[PDB]
Amino acid sequence: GSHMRNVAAEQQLRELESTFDGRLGFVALDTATGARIAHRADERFPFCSTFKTMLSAAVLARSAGDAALLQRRIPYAKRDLVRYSPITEKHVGAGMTVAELCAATLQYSDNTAADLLIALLGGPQAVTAYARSIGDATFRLDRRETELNTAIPGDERDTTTPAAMAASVRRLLVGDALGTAQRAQLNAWMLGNKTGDARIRAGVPAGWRVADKTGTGDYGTGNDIGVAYPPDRAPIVFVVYTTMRSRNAQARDDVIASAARIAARAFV
């Protein structure tokens, strides 16, 4: 790639933001060189369900020191379900294994699965502590699903910055924050995501595999974070956060995909 392409890409991100009534937080990192394409990289955004990557990583880290954990099956009843639980609603009673809950919350954004895992770890503060332990001094998880999706302007609960999340995604999926085998498992889960086809995935070429996690919330908040793996180049980290002025707004898959496409084409 080139510096002039990266600078031009950053201008294109400004122009893309100028087309909608909201803000765009964007970081893409070419891990061949650390080259960055960014917009509003240090502003806080409500992360909505993209925190489920950090959650699942924390669970994997705990499993590395407990051989029984991934197969532990956590029971729950119908009345324990929270809204948007497409997988866990099928297994009320005996419930699902911790590994299955991680896969459900990553691949279908299942909220009861997320809340069961947050409780397993000792509450939202345990997820924040895990983030700190991998070098993320920005990330904060304050609430559970579904309250963490309120995305109120000026509220710092359940927020991070695009730069902090891109460094964490890099360290988790590409680097050495997890052991080799846990990293592989987290990648596999996110590569099998079912909710991201219209976001980062829609902005990259057919041969690039994308391990991503989406988030959607109030104020038309539309997010996607992850790593794209071109077949014969270093991985590229993508972090896309968008949120709108109006509380009632819809999320914009097309904007998210366009932001990803701008960086994908600039890096090659």
XYZ file of N, CA and C in Angstrom:
804
model
N 0.858 -1.174 0.000
C 0.000 0.000 0.000
C 0.891 1.219 0.000
N 0.327 2.383 0.258
C 1.144 3.594 0.296
C 0.570 4.619 1.242
N 1.421 5.511 1.731
C 0.975 6.614 2.552
C -0.060 7.436 1.767
N 0.173 7.699 0.465
C -0.795 8.570 -0.200
C -2.164 7.892 -0.279
N -2.200 6.575 -0.459
C -3.490 5.858 -0.471
C -4.180 5.918 0.888
N -3.401 5.833 1.967
C -3.982 5.849 3.299
C -4.548 7.214 3.634
N -3.845 8.280 3.236
C -4.297 9.639 3.496
C -5.585 9.891 2.684
N -5.579 9.406 1.441
C -6.741 9.573 0.582
C -7.948 8.801 1.165
N -7.684 7.613 1.709
C -8.740 6.837 2.348
C -9.355 7.554 3.541
N -8.523 8.229 4.345
C -9.036 8.982 5.467
C -9.931 10.129 4.998
N -9.596 10.758 3.863
C -10.473 11.788 3.311
C -11.815 11.184 2.859
N -11.729 9.999 2.253
C -12.955 9.324 1.826
C -13.850 8.950 3.014
N -13.242 8.629 4.169
C -14.043 8.394 5.379
C -14.745 9.653 5.868
N -14.086 10.819 5.799
C -14.756 12.077 6.097
C -15.943 12.290 5.143
N -15.721 12.054 3.856
C -16.804 12.268 2.898
C -17.948 11.310 3.142
N -17.652 10.068 3.498
C -18.713 9.111 3.822
C -19.519 9.570 5.031
N -18.849 10.077 6.059
C -19.572 10.563 7.224
C -20.481 11.726 6.887
N -20.063 12.546 5.923
C -20.833 13.716 5.483
C -22.147 13.345 4.826
N -22.330 12.064 4.496
C -23.555 11.609 3.847
C -24.651 11.154 4.810
N -24.389 11.108 6.119
C -25.435 10.652 7.029
C -25.395 11.455 8.332
N -26.531 11.426 9.037
C -26.739 12.258 10.212
C -26.224 11.545 11.461
N -24.901 11.402 11.543
C -24.306 10.662 12.647
C -22.805 10.741 12.582
N -22.154 9.886 13.328
C -20.710 9.853 13.332
C -20.141 8.455 13.097
N -18.979 8.478 12.482
C -18.237 7.284 12.116
C -16.940 7.194 12.874
N -16.734 6.092 13.587
C -15.483 5.789 14.278
C -14.893 4.610 13.573
N -13.666 4.750 13.101
C -13.099 3.728 12.204
C -11.623 3.567 12.446
N -11.161 2.343 12.584
C -9.724 2.055 12.504
C -9.555 0.783 11.694
N -8.705 0.822 10.679
C -8.243 -0.392 10.017
C -6.717 -0.403 10.090
N -6.171 -1.584 10.376
C -4.718 -1.744 10.608
C -4.205 -2.812 9.675
N -3.229 -2.466 8.839
C -2.548 -3.497 8.035
C -1.417 -4.092 8.864
N -1.589 -5.320 9.331
C -0.596 -5.842 10.289
C 0.722 -6.198 9.616
N 0.823 -6.102 8.293
C 2.155 -6.219 7.657
C 3.092 -5.127 8.165
N 2.568 -3.939 8.449
C 3.388 -2.778 8.786
C 2.883 -1.913 9.911
N 1.682 -2.215 10.403
C 1.018 -1.327 11.338
C 0.397 -0.075 10.726
N 0.403 0.018 9.397
C -0.209 1.187 8.761
C -1.686 1.281 9.161
N -2.149 2.504 9.368
C -3.499 2.754 9.870
C -4.280 3.666 8.960
N -5.576 3.348 8.807
C -6.577 4.243 8.228
C -7.634 4.474 9.302
N -7.846 5.716 9.685
C -8.706 5.985 10.845
C -9.571 7.203 10.642
N -10.649 7.227 11.422
C -11.503 8.396 11.579
C -12.079 8.359 13.001
N -11.956 9.480 13.716
C -12.480 9.591 15.107
C -11.966 8.415 15.972
N -10.682 8.100 15.805
C -10.113 6.911 16.434
C -10.112 6.934 17.958
N -10.110 8.139 18.524
C -10.013 8.300 19.989
C -11.296 8.814 20.640
N -12.387 8.828 19.896
C -13.665 9.157 20.503
C -14.310 7.911 21.057
N -15.062 8.057 22.140
C -15.807 6.921 22.680
C -17.099 6.691 21.907
N -17.423 5.416 21.720
C -18.661 4.962 21.059
C -19.291 3.868 21.904
N -20.622 3.749 21.910
C -21.259 2.602 22.555
C -20.973 1.343 21.743
N -20.383 0.328 22.371
C -19.954 -0.830 21.601
C -21.051 -1.853 21.321
N -22.172 -1.786 22.038
C -23.285 -2.735 21.862
C -22.725 -4.155 21.806
N -23.215 -5.019 20.928
C -22.820 -6.438 21.090
C -21.402 -6.737 20.683
N -20.624 -5.757 20.183
C -19.264 -6.088 19.817
C -18.468 -6.461 21.073
N -18.947 -6.133 22.275
C -18.225 -6.590 23.482
C -18.204 -8.105 23.651
N -19.074 -8.813 22.930
C -19.156 -10.268 23.096
C -17.863 -10.955 22.679
N -17.036 -10.316 21.843
C -15.686 -10.819 21.569
C -14.793 -10.755 22.826
N -14.755 -9.606 23.504
C -14.011 -9.466 24.742
C -14.522 -10.470 25.822
N -15.841 -10.616 25.919
C -16.453 -11.571 26.856
C -15.982 -13.015 26.598
N -16.044 -13.410 25.328
C -15.688 -14.769 24.956
C -14.219 -15.015 25.148
N -13.397 -14.002 24.873
C -11.989 -14.132 25.169
C -11.731 -14.339 26.656
N -12.448 -13.610 27.499
C -12.265 -13.760 28.937
C -12.647 -15.184 29.371
N -13.705 -15.715 28.763
C -14.134 -17.080 29.102
C -13.062 -18.085 28.673
N -12.517 -17.899 27.473
C -11.411 -18.768 27.010
C -10.199 -18.683 27.913
N -9.868 -17.486 28.367
C -8.755 -17.341 29.273
C -9.022 -18.100 30.577
N -10.240 -18.039 31.088
C -10.527 -18.782 32.296
C -10.459 -20.280 32.039
N -10.857 -20.721 30.854
C -10.843 -22.152 30.540
C -9.437 -22.690 30.434
N -8.489 -21.826 30.109
C -7.111 -22.296 29.988
C -6.608 -22.777 31.361
N -7.223 -22.310 32.445
C -6.872 -22.789 33.772
C -7.904 -23.684 34.465
N -8.849 -24.199 33.692
C -9.909 -25.069 34.232
C -10.387 -26.033 33.158
N -9.952 -27.299 33.237
C -10.224 -28.273 32.211
C -11.718 -28.650 32.109
N -12.490 -28.402 33.170
C -13.927 -28.757 33.189
C -14.798 -27.642 32.654
N -14.255 -26.426 32.468
C -15.127 -25.291 32.214
C -15.877 -25.299 30.886
N -15.203 -25.584 29.766
C -15.885 -25.439 28.487
C -17.056 -26.384 28.312
N -16.989 -27.528 28.999
C -18.097 -28.483 28.964
C -19.082 -28.366 30.091
N -18.838 -27.472 31.049
C -19.849 -27.214 32.069
C -21.174 -26.764 31.419
N -22.276 -27.383 31.810
C -23.545 -27.013 31.187
C -24.319 -26.189 32.207
N -24.702 -24.976 31.840
C -25.328 -24.056 32.782
C -26.842 -24.045 32.539
N -27.615 -24.510 33.514
C -29.079 -24.574 33.340
C -29.697 -23.186 33.467
N -30.860 -23.005 32.872
C -31.610 -21.767 33.032
C -33.046 -22.115 32.643
N -33.996 -21.297 33.082
C -35.425 -21.526 32.769
C -35.949 -20.512 31.773
N -37.176 -20.721 31.265
C -37.823 -19.779 30.346
C -37.830 -18.365 30.907
N -38.080 -18.233 32.201
C -38.215 -16.905 32.776
C -36.853 -16.223 32.922
N -35.766 -16.969 32.728
C -34.428 -16.360 32.745
C -33.991 -15.724 31.417
N -34.686 -16.058 30.340
C -34.340 -15.572 29.015
C -34.486 -14.070 28.949
N -33.528 -13.445 28.292
C -33.692 -12.023 28.032
C -33.988 -11.892 26.543
N -34.380 -10.741 26.132
C -34.716 -10.519 24.745
C -33.572 -10.778 23.788
N -33.937 -11.324 22.635
C -33.037 -11.688 21.568
C -32.102 -12.832 21.994
N -32.722 -14.020 22.046
C -32.056 -15.256 22.501
C -32.405 -16.409 21.548
N -32.021 -16.267 20.274
C -32.477 -17.233 19.265
C -31.950 -18.645 19.493
N -30.805 -18.769 20.138
C -30.232 -20.106 20.342
C -30.621 -20.620 21.715
N -30.363 -19.834 22.758
C -30.652 -20.319 24.108
C -32.127 -20.578 24.365
N -33.057 -19.936 23.650
C -34.464 -20.216 23.891
C -34.850 -21.667 23.519
N -33.996 -22.318 22.717
C -34.214 -23.702 22.274
C -33.772 -24.744 23.302
N -33.080 -24.305 24.341
C -32.425 -25.253 25.254
C -32.718 -24.948 26.701
N -33.852 -24.301 26.968
C -34.265 -24.075 28.328
C -34.383 -25.386 29.114
N -34.094 -25.302 30.399
C -34.101 -26.463 31.276
C -32.655 -26.781 31.601
N -32.111 -27.815 30.972
C -30.721 -28.177 31.222
C -29.725 -27.176 30.653
N -30.120 -26.368 29.669
C -29.228 -25.337 29.162
C -28.174 -25.861 28.221
N -27.048 -25.143 28.122
C -26.042 -25.355 27.113
C -24.664 -25.342 27.764
N -23.673 -25.925 27.097
C -22.316 -25.897 27.655
C -21.731 -24.479 27.488
N -20.726 -24.177 28.307
C -20.070 -22.875 28.192
C -19.529 -22.674 26.767
N -18.918 -23.687 26.140
C -18.463 -23.517 24.758
C -19.620 -23.199 23.840
N -20.740 -23.886 24.023
C -21.893 -23.626 23.172
C -22.443 -22.215 23.396
N -22.391 -21.726 24.645
C -22.851 -20.356 24.947
C -21.935 -19.333 24.281
N -20.625 -19.562 24.318
C -19.726 -18.667 23.581
C -20.071 -18.640 22.080
N -20.221 -19.819 21.474
C -20.571 -19.848 20.061
C -21.895 -19.164 19.796
N -22.900 -19.349 20.631
C -24.189 -18.723 20.410
C -24.102 -17.194 20.508
N -23.176 -16.736 21.456
C -23.293 -15.296 21.653
C -22.496 -14.546 20.580
N -21.449 -15.294 20.088
C -20.655 -14.746 19.018
C -21.347 -14.878 17.670
N -22.021 -16.008 17.408
C -22.482 -16.248 16.033
C -23.888 -15.772 15.778
N -24.708 -15.693 16.803
C -26.085 -15.241 16.699
C -26.379 -14.029 17.590
N -25.338 -13.568 18.278
C -25.475 -12.411 19.206
C -26.495 -12.696 20.355
N -26.629 -13.974 20.737
C -27.573 -14.401 21.763
C -27.324 -13.695 23.121
N -28.361 -13.020 23.598
C -28.216 -12.196 24.816
C -28.285 -12.982 26.107
N -29.081 -14.047 26.166
C -29.117 -14.833 27.400
C -27.757 -15.494 27.518
N -27.198 -15.972 26.410
C -25.874 -16.569 26.459
C -24.860 -15.561 26.993
N -24.906 -14.320 26.501
C -23.973 -13.319 27.012
C -24.163 -13.108 28.526
N -25.407 -13.000 28.992
C -25.643 -12.724 30.410
C -25.220 -13.898 31.287
N -25.396 -15.116 30.818
C -24.927 -16.291 31.562
C -23.417 -16.275 31.703
N -22.721 -15.884 30.646
C -21.247 -15.855 30.672
C -20.730 -14.701 31.533
N -21.386 -13.547 31.467
C -21.006 -12.406 32.325
C -21.167 -12.847 33.777
N -22.262 -13.516 34.098
C -22.470 -13.954 35.482
C -21.404 -14.992 35.891
N -21.123 -15.943 34.996
C -20.071 -16.922 35.246
C -18.734 -16.282 35.649
N -18.370 -15.200 34.955
C -17.088 -14.562 35.201
C -17.083 -13.706 36.450
N -18.250 -13.386 37.000
C -18.323 -12.570 38.197
C -18.856 -11.178 37.954
N -19.543 -10.963 36.832
C -20.203 -9.696 36.535
C -19.444 -8.854 35.517
N -20.057 -7.754 35.106
C -19.435 -6.893 34.082
C -18.035 -6.429 34.454
N -17.782 -6.153 35.724
C -16.434 -5.726 36.068
C -15.355 -6.772 35.755
N -15.683 -8.067 35.732
C -14.695 -9.077 35.380
C -14.324 -8.953 33.912
N -15.282 -8.551 33.054
C -14.949 -8.394 31.636
C -14.023 -7.168 31.452
N -14.319 -6.084 32.170
C -13.426 -4.920 32.147
C -12.040 -5.288 32.667
N -11.975 -6.054 33.752
C -10.667 -6.466 34.262
C -9.914 -7.323 33.252
N -10.635 -8.167 32.526
C -9.952 -8.961 31.513
C -9.381 -8.027 30.424
N -10.174 -7.052 29.969
C -9.684 -6.073 29.017
C -8.409 -5.388 29.530
N -8.374 -4.980 30.782
C -7.194 -4.370 31.315
C -6.003 -5.321 31.237
N -6.264 -6.595 31.435
C -5.202 -7.587 31.503
C -4.581 -7.830 30.135
N -5.240 -7.423 29.038
C -4.655 -7.566 27.704
C -4.251 -6.188 27.179
N -4.133 -5.210 28.070
C -3.579 -3.916 27.657
C -4.589 -2.863 27.221
N -5.872 -3.124 27.444
C -6.936 -2.226 27.040
C -7.340 -1.412 28.257
N -6.871 -0.162 28.290
C -7.167 0.727 29.408
C -8.382 1.619 29.121
N -9.142 1.296 28.073
C -10.221 2.153 27.594
C -11.602 1.503 27.727
N -11.674 0.258 27.260
C -12.879 -0.567 27.309
C -13.520 -0.552 28.696
N -14.844 -0.414 28.770
C -15.529 -0.601 30.054
C -16.887 -1.248 29.819
N -17.101 -2.366 30.509
C -18.432 -2.999 30.544
C -19.076 -2.728 31.880
N -20.215 -2.049 31.836
C -20.940 -1.601 33.043
C -22.246 -2.292 33.288
N -22.927 -2.653 32.219
C -24.276 -3.245 32.344
C -24.303 -4.578 31.625
N -25.425 -5.262 31.716
C -25.657 -6.542 31.038
C -26.559 -6.325 29.843
N -26.834 -7.395 29.101
C -27.818 -7.314 28.021
C -29.181 -7.305 28.661
N -30.121 -6.462 28.206
C -30.006 -5.613 27.005
C -29.766 -4.132 27.287
N -29.650 -3.784 28.558
C -29.504 -2.359 28.914
C -28.234 -1.685 28.337
N -27.189 -2.461 28.038
C -25.979 -1.842 27.554
C -26.156 -1.283 26.124
N -27.318 -1.477 25.481
C -27.524 -0.956 24.130
C -28.194 0.397 24.041
N -28.358 1.096 25.167
C -29.075 2.359 25.145
C -28.337 3.428 24.320
N -27.002 3.386 24.322
C -26.198 4.204 23.401
C -26.509 5.704 23.516
N -26.697 6.179 24.749
C -27.067 7.550 24.949
C -25.896 8.466 24.716
N -26.045 9.512 23.911
C -24.933 10.458 23.713
C -24.421 11.055 25.041
N -23.096 11.049 25.192
C -22.450 11.577 26.382
C -22.286 10.585 27.531
N -22.972 9.449 27.468
C -22.914 8.417 28.494
C -21.666 7.569 28.200
N -20.822 7.411 29.181
C -19.591 6.660 28.945
C -19.743 5.168 29.322
N -20.883 4.766 29.910
C -21.058 3.347 30.244
C -21.039 2.510 28.977
N -20.390 1.349 29.040
C -20.430 0.370 27.918
C -19.891 0.992 26.611
N -18.757 1.668 26.718
C -18.112 2.303 25.563
C -16.662 1.896 25.467
N -16.113 2.147 24.277
C -14.662 2.064 24.034
C -14.360 3.014 22.901
N -13.109 3.068 22.486
C -12.729 3.871 21.310
C -12.376 2.930 20.174
N -12.478 3.403 18.934
C -12.046 2.552 17.828
C -10.581 2.134 17.966
N -9.673 3.016 18.364
C -8.261 2.640 18.495
C -8.061 1.589 19.581
N -8.749 1.729 20.715
C -8.515 0.741 21.756
C -9.042 -0.620 21.320
N -10.217 -0.619 20.669
C -10.804 -1.904 20.301
C -9.988 -2.563 19.176
N -9.425 -1.778 18.257
C -8.628 -2.347 17.169
C -7.360 -2.995 17.747
N -6.733 -2.350 18.753
C -5.544 -2.959 19.372
C -5.956 -4.247 20.087
N -7.098 -4.253 20.783
C -7.525 -5.474 21.448
C -7.868 -6.610 20.469
N -8.571 -6.286 19.384
C -8.910 -7.273 18.384
C -7.615 -7.816 17.788
N -6.653 -6.943 17.499
C -5.385 -7.444 16.978
C -4.731 -8.400 17.950
N -4.585 -7.977 19.198
C -3.904 -8.812 20.186
C -4.601 -10.148 20.401
N -5.925 -10.176 20.332
C -6.716 -11.374 20.594
C -6.731 -12.321 19.401
N -6.976 -11.795 18.195
C -7.187 -12.661 17.032
C -5.888 -12.931 16.249
N -4.938 -12.004 16.299
C -3.701 -12.097 15.489
C -2.482 -12.316 16.390
N -2.438 -11.651 17.536
C -1.320 -11.680 18.445
C -1.392 -12.710 19.537
N -0.768 -12.377 20.662
C -0.512 -13.377 21.685
C -1.210 -13.093 23.003
N -2.328 -12.386 22.958
C -3.088 -12.184 24.185
C -3.670 -13.507 24.725
N -4.074 -14.404 23.830
C -4.528 -15.754 24.143
C -3.434 -16.743 23.739
N -3.452 -17.915 24.374
C -2.610 -19.000 23.894
C -3.015 -19.376 22.484
N -2.086 -20.033 21.779
C -2.272 -20.444 20.393
C -3.608 -21.144 20.164
N -3.951 -22.104 21.021
C -5.190 -22.848 20.806
C -6.500 -22.071 21.114
N -6.435 -21.182 22.107
C -7.606 -20.359 22.448
C -7.876 -19.331 21.332
N -6.795 -18.786 20.804
C -6.879 -17.851 19.685
C -7.546 -18.492 18.485
N -7.148 -19.730 18.205
C -7.746 -20.463 17.120
C -9.248 -20.684 17.317
N -9.620 -21.026 18.549
C -11.026 -21.224 18.858
C -11.888 -19.927 18.718
N -11.347 -18.838 19.245
C -12.037 -17.547 19.131
C -12.196 -17.156 17.633
N -11.093 -17.275 16.876
C -11.192 -17.019 15.435
C -12.250 -17.860 14.728
N -12.243 -19.173 15.020
C -13.206 -20.066 14.398
C -14.654 -19.690 14.695
N -14.898 -19.366 15.975
C -16.238 -18.922 16.338
C -16.663 -17.668 15.553
N -15.769 -16.679 15.522
C -16.104 -15.440 14.835
C -16.174 -15.575 13.297
N -15.392 -16.495 12.731
C -15.463 -16.777 11.293
C -16.794 -17.390 10.948
N -17.408 -18.064 11.922
C -18.709 -18.656 11.695
C -19.889 -17.793 12.057
N -19.626 -16.495 12.270
C -20.688 -15.534 12.573
C -21.812 -15.543 11.516
N -23.072 -15.473 11.919
C -24.190 -15.418 10.987
C -24.821 -14.032 10.843
N -24.352 -13.057 11.621
C -25.021 -11.737 11.656
C -24.327 -10.599 10.885
N -23.189 -10.903 10.271
C -22.321 -9.868 9.711
C -22.228 -9.765 8.200
N -23.097 -10.459 7.476
C -22.945 -10.521 6.032
C -23.064 -9.180 5.320
N -23.774 -8.235 5.903
C -23.968 -6.960 5.240
C -23.006 -5.858 5.738
N -22.048 -6.208 6.612
C -21.217 -5.170 7.239
C -19.783 -5.323 6.703
N -18.757 -5.542 7.517
C -17.373 -5.646 6.978
C -17.275 -6.641 5.804
N -17.921 -7.782 5.954
C -17.892 -8.827 4.929
C -18.338 -8.332 3.562
N -19.271 -7.401 3.523
C -19.776 -6.884 2.247
C -18.808 -5.912 1.581
N -17.767 -5.490 2.292
C -16.791 -4.547 1.775
C -15.463 -5.117 1.367
N -15.264 -6.420 1.482
C -14.009 -7.057 1.112
C -14.166 -8.064 -0.034
N -13.062 -8.378 -0.718
C -13.107 -9.356 -1.815
C -13.496 -10.762 -1.354
N -13.923 -11.569 -2.326
C -14.437 -12.908 -2.062
C -13.480 -13.857 -1.371
N -12.180 -13.691 -1.566
C -11.220 -14.583 -0.931
C -10.778 -14.184 0.461
N -11.269 -13.058 0.969
C -10.824 -12.653 2.285
C -11.803 -13.201 3.306
N -11.290 -13.994 4.236
C -12.131 -14.526 5.295
C -12.182 -13.548 6.461
N -13.360 -13.353 7.029
C -13.555 -12.308 8.031
C -14.053 -12.897 9.333
N -13.261 -12.731 10.381
C -13.698 -13.103 11.703
C -14.274 -11.818 12.304
N -15.577 -11.705 12.436
C -16.157 -10.444 12.919
C -17.281 -10.630 13.945
N -17.526 -9.562 14.676
C -18.677 -9.530 15.601
C -19.403 -8.205 15.428
N -20.708 -8.255 15.196
C -21.525 -7.080 14.980
C -22.072 -6.542 16.292
N -22.481 -5.280 16.260
C -23.313 -4.745 17.335
C -24.345 -3.791 16.789
N -25.535 -3.770 17.363
C -26.592 -2.850 16.950
C -27.321 -2.338 18.188
N -27.683 -1.065 18.223
C -28.325 -0.519 19.417
C -29.184 0.676 19.077
N -29.620 1.378 20.122
C -30.433 2.544 19.939
C -29.596 3.649 19.291
N -30.209 4.771 18.941
C -29.532 5.854 18.233
C -28.916 5.290 16.935
N -29.549 4.275 16.353
C -29.111 3.726 15.069
C -27.664 3.286 15.136
N -27.254 2.750 16.281
C -25.856 2.364 16.454
C -25.625 1.070 15.690
N -24.597 1.090 14.819
C -24.300 -0.039 13.942
C -22.794 -0.212 13.913
N -22.362 -1.357 14.413
C -20.958 -1.634 14.646
C -20.545 -2.952 14.050
N -19.273 -3.099 13.757
C -18.702 -4.408 13.361
C -17.211 -4.328 13.604
N -16.666 -5.354 14.242
C -15.218 -5.407 14.529
C -14.687 -6.774 14.147
N -13.423 -6.835 13.755
C -12.840 -8.121 13.464
C -11.575 -8.041 12.666
N -11.234 -9.173 12.054
C -10.013 -9.332 11.263
C -10.375 -9.973 9.936
N -9.854 -9.402 8.861
C -9.942 -10.032 7.549
C -8.610 -10.660 7.221
N -8.696 -11.849 6.681
C -7.527 -12.652 6.334
C -7.464 -12.828 4.823
N -6.719 -11.969 4.131
C -6.493 -12.226 2.703
C -5.640 -13.486 2.578
N -5.761 -14.175 1.439
C -5.070 -15.453 1.327
C -3.551 -15.358 1.271
N -2.982 -14.260 0.770
C -1.514 -14.221 0.624
C -0.899 -12.873 1.046
N -1.508 -12.276 2.066
C -1.054 -11.032 2.685
C -1.350 -11.132 4.177
N -0.716 -10.269 4.975
C -0.931 -10.216 6.414
C -2.395 -9.858 6.703
N -2.897 -10.279 7.864
C -4.279 -9.924 8.268
C -4.465 -8.416 8.440
N -5.693 -7.993 8.216
C -6.076 -6.595 8.374
C -7.149 -6.518 9.450
N -6.907 -5.690 10.465
C -7.892 -5.437 11.512
C -8.880 -4.363 11.057
N -10.156 -4.600 11.294
C -11.242 -3.615 11.019
C -12.055 -3.343 12.245
N -12.231 -2.069 12.574
C -13.132 -1.678 13.633
C -13.995 -0.563 13.107
N -15.303 -0.799 13.081
C -16.255 0.179 12.562
C -17.334 0.420 13.584
N -17.423 1.642 14.093
C -18.472 2.061 15.041
C -19.239 3.202 14.391
N -20.560 3.112 14.348
C -21.359 4.266 13.873
C -22.522 4.486 14.818
N -22.905 5.747 14.971
C -24.054 6.044 15.812
C -24.640 7.341 15.315
N -25.955 7.502 15.508
C -26.681 8.581 14.832
C -27.194 9.621 15.790
N -27.588 10.765 15.240
C -28.076 11.847 16.103
C -29.446 11.535 16.706
N -30.296 10.879 15.935
C -31.661 10.617 16.370
C -31.784 9.299 17.126
N -32.446 9.310 18.282
C -32.597 8.087 19.057
C -33.302 6.984 18.290
N -34.218 7.423 17.414
C -35.077 6.546 16.621
C -34.450 5.995 15.332
N -33.220 6.427 15.003
C -32.599 6.116 13.717
C -32.386 4.620 13.500
N -32.376 4.189 12.236
C -31.949 2.825 11.918
C -30.420 2.779 11.794
N -29.886 1.613 12.074
C -28.488 1.353 11.780
C -28.263 1.286 10.275
N -27.022 1.567 9.841
C -26.695 1.692 8.422
C -25.677 0.650 7.981
N -26.126 -0.552 7.621
C -25.222 -1.578 7.123
C -24.415 -1.053 5.931
N -25.060 -0.290 5.067
C -24.400 0.167 3.855
C -23.211 1.077 4.162
N -23.358 1.932 5.174
C -22.280 2.818 5.599
C -21.134 1.988 6.178
N -21.438 0.993 6.996
C -20.407 0.163 7.595
C -19.611 -0.575 6.528
N -20.316 -1.194 5.584
C -19.694 -1.875 4.490
C -18.853 -0.900 3.657
N -19.370 0.296 3.387
C -18.596 1.262 2.589
C -17.315 1.696 3.313
N -17.379 1.839 4.635
C -16.183 2.246 5.373
C -15.141 1.131 5.281
N -15.560 -0.112 5.455
C -14.640 -1.222 5.301
C -14.054 -1.277 3.898
N -14.887 -1.095 2.885
C -14.444 -1.166 1.508
C -13.374 -0.105 1.224
N -13.545 1.089 1.762
C -12.541 2.155 1.600
C -11.158 1.676 2.087
N -11.072 1.083 3.265
C -9.783 0.626 3.741
C -9.301 -0.612 3.036
N -10.182 -1.560 2.724
C -9.773 -2.774 2.028
C -9.142 -2.454 0.694
N -9.739 -1.548 -0.046
C -9.181 -1.174 -1.324
C -7.887 -0.358 -1.153
N -7.754 0.449 -0.097
C -6.545 1.223 0.094
C -5.380 0.351 0.500
N -5.598 -0.761 1.185
C -4.491 -1.587 1.653
C -4.039 -2.634 0.618
N -4.944 -2.981 -0.306
C -4.817 -3.827 -1.530
C -5.968 -4.796 -1.618
